């Protein structure tokens, strides 16, 4: 009815310690979502096209020519870590549990309220907001996954991360097909490389409508749309990292010279010279058995061509990297490549009392030591002589192709059958929770953006829309735009994500690294005098585990 509430706000994370080792984490989350009517009730096909930044020869990577379909439907996305967990509750998954997997997911919409604004204006500019008890809210849940899957944490457009703050849904859109060609260049090319937007190939044309594919529920003011519980099937996510590269695997060499006075320059020594040692080498024709050339069971991590921009039917793109290296060789300005950089606004982690256009960024440096340091690689000849000459080694200093800023390790790939690598860690609060596996035949082993990948089916996307409140002067035969009563809707959303995590144990003598609060970050976790909140990023793989 009109004056009967249809739900309950619930925003508490509930740890149910079930049988030996395992916890049932039920993360409740509920928001107040503010939705106003779309600017147009049509499906446009807008082509985004810049020839001012990619037409200048030298920046091909500034290309964002695409074609898309802007829909009147909004998207209530909840696929980010901070929608569910406050920073005091990362804190208790992240240094108490060891692995973690994803169980179920629910979604509801309750206490729907639609209001119309109408200015009176004898001479104020003032507005009157009165309830519409018969206006409807159109809700469509794509439970069959017919729509294009557009995960909205890659654009930092999710529900907000604070429970006491109202949020907005995102004006859903999807990629239409286009063809284009961008021939690369630099600042000194002669002539003009081609920059043509061809059009749309009429075999890959796909125009989706929410009306023809989804059953839409029209929620009035007393109405509640609860979806089911979607049970996932994913692999478990490890909350522990690996410190071992391909140089700390196996049996160390027998130091038969041990340091007699403990200190900082008292090194132990292997008493055997390198050409007289025993062990398995894979180098075939050399008698040197050192720590670099001793045979390992596999290879940990891989090298990839960094800042390599491939091309395809519809423009250039960057090849993704799975890589992370924490502290030793990374300086503060350029840590690595392949470690993600997030940008976000005041709703999603920036301080809510900063007036500005620019977002807030961090670069997530993972704790897993599985990446590569390309300045320490070298390709040398098969003869393997004592100190190697210049025509028998390929350093990262010499030019490849004549370019002094391009060496061989910019095009180097050592993905092989012996490469072992780890999944991506969670990124609190901005990373995705779950992604959708590709509908190809040979699926990738990783997704760079989410730790959980739903193989068979993903949760259905929830689309909301304000039903058209028309005025009395309407006819569908005029080419001019439709005239509507200006309506907006404030409904309440509530999700419930269930995890299942395993409590960590103490294997080693020494204490491991734990996420804490201290003097230099005590003020990221409390408000500040105006109500300015923020959620700073936290690491997710704090504890170490042995790879071998």
């Amino acid at each position, epitope marked *: 009815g009109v004056g009967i509430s249809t739900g309950t706000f619930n925003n508490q994370t509930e740890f149910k310690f079930l049988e030996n080792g395992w916890v049932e984490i039920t993360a409740n989350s509920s928001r107040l979502v503010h939705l106003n009517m779309p600017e147009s009730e049509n499906y446009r096909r807008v082509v985004v096209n*810049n*020839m*001012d*930044k990619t*037409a*200048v*020869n030298g920046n091909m990577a500034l290309d964002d020519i695409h074609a898309q379909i802007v829909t009147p439907w909004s998207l209530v996305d909840a696929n980010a870590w901070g929608v569910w967990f406050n920073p005091g509750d990362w804190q208790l998954i992240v240094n108490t549990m060891s692995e973690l997997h994803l169980v179920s997911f629910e979604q509801e919409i309750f206490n729907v309220v639609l209001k119309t604004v109408s200015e009176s204006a004898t001479q104020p500019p003032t507005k009157v907001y009165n309830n519409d008890l018969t206006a409807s809210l159109m809700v469509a849940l794509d439970s069959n996954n017919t729509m294009p899957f557009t995960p909205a944490a890659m654009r930092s457009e999710t529900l907000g991360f604070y429970p006491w703050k109202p949020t907005i849904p995102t004006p859903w859109r999807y990629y239409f097909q286009w063809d284009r060609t961008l021939i690369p*260049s*630099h*600042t*000194g*090319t*002669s*002539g*003009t*490389p081609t920059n043509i937007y061809h059009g749309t190939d009429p075999d890959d044309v796909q125009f989706y409508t929410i009306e023809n594919s989804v059953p839409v529920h029209l929620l009035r003011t007393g109405d509640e749309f609860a979806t089911g519980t979607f049970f996932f099937d994913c692999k478990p996510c490890r909350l522990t990292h690996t410190w071992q590269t391909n140089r700390a695997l196996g049996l160390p060499p027998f130091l038969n010279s041990l340091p007699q006075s403990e200190g900082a320059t008292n090194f132990g020594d292997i008493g055997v010279q390198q050409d007289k040692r025993r062990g398995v080498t894979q180098m075939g024709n050399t008698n040197y058995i050192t720590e670099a050339t001793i045979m390992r069971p596999a290879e940990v991590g891989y090298s990839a061509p960094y800042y390599s921009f491939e091309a395809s039917t519809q423009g250039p793109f960057k090849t993704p990297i799975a890589a992370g290296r924490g502290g030793a060789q990374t300086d503060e300005n350029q840590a690595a490549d392949g470690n993600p950089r997030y940008a976000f606004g005041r709703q999603h982690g920036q301080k809510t009392t900063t007036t500005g256009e620019t977002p807030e960024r961090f670069t997530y440096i993972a704790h897993q030591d599985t990446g590569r340091y390309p300045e320490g690689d070298w390709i040398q000849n098969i003869n393997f002589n004592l100190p190697v000459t210049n025509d028998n080694v390929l350093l990262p200093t010499d030019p490849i192709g004549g370019k002094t800023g391009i060496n061989y390790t910019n095009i180097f790939n050592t993905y092989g059958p012996l490469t072992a690598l780890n999944n991506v860690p969670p990124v609190y609060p901005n990373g995705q929770i779950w992604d959708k596996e590709f509908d190809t035949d040979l699926k990738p082993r990783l997704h760079v953006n989410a730790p959980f990948v739903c193989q068979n089916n993903c949760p259905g996307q929830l689309f909301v829309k304000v039903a058209p409140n028309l005025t009395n002067e309407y006819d569908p035969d005029a080419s001019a735009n439709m005239s509507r009563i200006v309506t907006y809707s404030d409904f309440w959303w509530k999700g419930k994500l269930v995890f299942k995590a395993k409590l960590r144990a103490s294997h080693t003598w020494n204490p491991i690294q734990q996420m804490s609060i201290n003097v230099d970050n005590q003020f990221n976790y409390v408000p500040s005098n105006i109500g300015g909140m923020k959620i700073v990023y936290e690491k997710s793989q704090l504890a170490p585990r042995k790879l071998y």
Partner: antibody
Amino acid sequence: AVHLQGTELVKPGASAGVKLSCKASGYTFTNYDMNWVRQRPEQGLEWIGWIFPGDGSTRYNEKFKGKATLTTDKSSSTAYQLNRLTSEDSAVYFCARRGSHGSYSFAYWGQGTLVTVSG
Amino acid sequence: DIVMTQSHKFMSTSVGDRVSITCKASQDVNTALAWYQQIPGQSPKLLIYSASNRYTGVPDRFTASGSGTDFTFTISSVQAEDLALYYCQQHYTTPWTFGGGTKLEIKR
């Protein structure tokens, strides 16, 4: 038909700034950034910075950081430049646009707008 | 910041001759160099871009060459309207820096 139209010759005092202008014509304004070039009669030509009218992406050089700020006025096809300090910088200020090629070699310039700062 | 040095401030020319204006850069620009002609009191005019290519409508007596640090500008038959200030600009990296300028003048 592409044509740039600088403002008239200004006479400021040596305390404040005076805004210059350059109305573009004969081409779509948003496809090309407007570069500003200063020509002192002693120092040759000096590039100040560009401004894309596509949501205002500026660059400058380091000797013109707090010295001049570039804006544009969309839907009127004109550019601007404040020249905030204006101490000894009496020169001809040029309004340059790239051209058909793609390299940063200015094909269409303005007519020049002489600033004369003095006491 | 690449500094650009032109080899002469003034080059004595006869009408009908062959003049070689030279610009030398500090850092190795690949071709990345534009040539400008400015009669004084007027806006400069783009003649050469990318150190070899002629702009559309520029007459064919102006040729240019060079790659690396040494560049040259050539007028095969110097005429009356070719005696101006000749400028050298690099479109390699930001900030774009101009040359010192070279004034073609009459051999007295």
